[PDB]
Ligand binder design. Structure first.
Ligand SMILES: C=C1/C(=C\C=C2/CCC[C@]3(C)[C@@H]([C@H](C)CCCC(C)(C)O)CC[C@@H]23)C[C@@H](O)[C@H](CCCO)[C@@H]1O
Length: 254
């Protein structure tokens, strides 16, 4: 019912987050030529044995994810209040949310035109088959695609999109966090900003219930995180896999 106006502080928070995202997410994907080249071996059969023997798309995707983790770290550092946290808690939050924020932010390159993450010419267009060529199984990919479509259909404003990523990162319920209270205080400030923004700036019929739907996506991400971790473990058993990854990836998921 009540639709309070965004406070000056809440307006500043949104402005800061939009700016942080614009500085850490390049919509032209111009740095991609700097990653190890994507290689797509013939695997129409989806052979796990062949996929693991080659891991043809792993160097490229590992570089893409590593690059993205760096961007997420940069984004996180700009989240109002994040700097108030101890270095130890900052790292805990970053490592635990990295893959989740990558899945969220990737929605910007995801397209329902053909259910792919399109970052340019065919070379940088990623489909389910490209992810299997990196060593992952459909147990992760299919649910991930479903998540992308569900997120797409929420038609989030960029303001809502950046707030959701910030809320995802600043979560008090991450194993290893020391000052949960402070983290929750920061998250509540972000959550209240999001709730207020939706109530006074998001037109119907895709509003209000929108907050609940967004919070539900955060729960969905936890499941995807767990599944990705299980599969990363398997992938790491492959001899010489470390060289196909990056130091940052090895640490975050190791
Ligand atoms: C990275 C990103 C993109 C796409 C994300 C994809 C497409 C290919 C496969 C991935 C990467 C999934 C797999 C499951 C993760 C695999 C990781 C390992 C192999 C380590 O397990 C997770 C998200 C999937 C491109 C762009 O939108 C951002 C980037 C450009 C703007 O900053 C974003 O940040």
């Amino acid at each position: 019912s009540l639709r309070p106006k965004l406070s000056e502080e809440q307006q500043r928070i949104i402005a800061i987050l939009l700016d942080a995202h614009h500085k850490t997410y390049d919509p032209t994907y111009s740095d991609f030529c700097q990653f190890r080249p994507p290689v797509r071996v013939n695997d129409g059969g989806g052979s796990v044995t062949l996929e693991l023997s080659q891991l043809s798309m792993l160097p490229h995707l590992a570089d893409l994810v590593s690059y993205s983790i760096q961007k997420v770290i940069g984004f996180a550092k700009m989240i109002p209040g994040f700097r108030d946290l101890t270095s130890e808690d900052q790292i805990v939050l970053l490592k635990s949310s990295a893959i989740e924020v990558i899945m969220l932010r990737s929605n910007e390159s995801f397209t329902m035109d053909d259910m792919s993450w399109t970052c340019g010419n065919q070379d940088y267009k990623y489909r389910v088959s490209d992810v299997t060529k990196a060593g992952h199984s459909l147990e992760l990919i299919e649910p991930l695609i479903k998540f992308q479509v569900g997120l797409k259909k929420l038609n989030l404003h960029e303001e809502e999109h950046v707030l959701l990523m910030a809320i995802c990162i600043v979560s008090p319920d991450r194993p290893g966090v020391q000052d949960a209270a402070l983290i929750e205080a920061i998250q509540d400030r972000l959550s209240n900003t999001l709730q207020t923004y939706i109530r006074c700036r998001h037109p119907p019929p895709g509003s209000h219930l929108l907050y609940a739907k967004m919070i539900q996506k955060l729960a969905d991400l936890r499941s995807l995180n767990e599944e990705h971790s299980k599969q990363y473990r398997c992938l790491s058993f492959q001899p010489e896999c470390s060289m196909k990854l990056t130091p940052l990836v090895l640490e975050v998921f190791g």
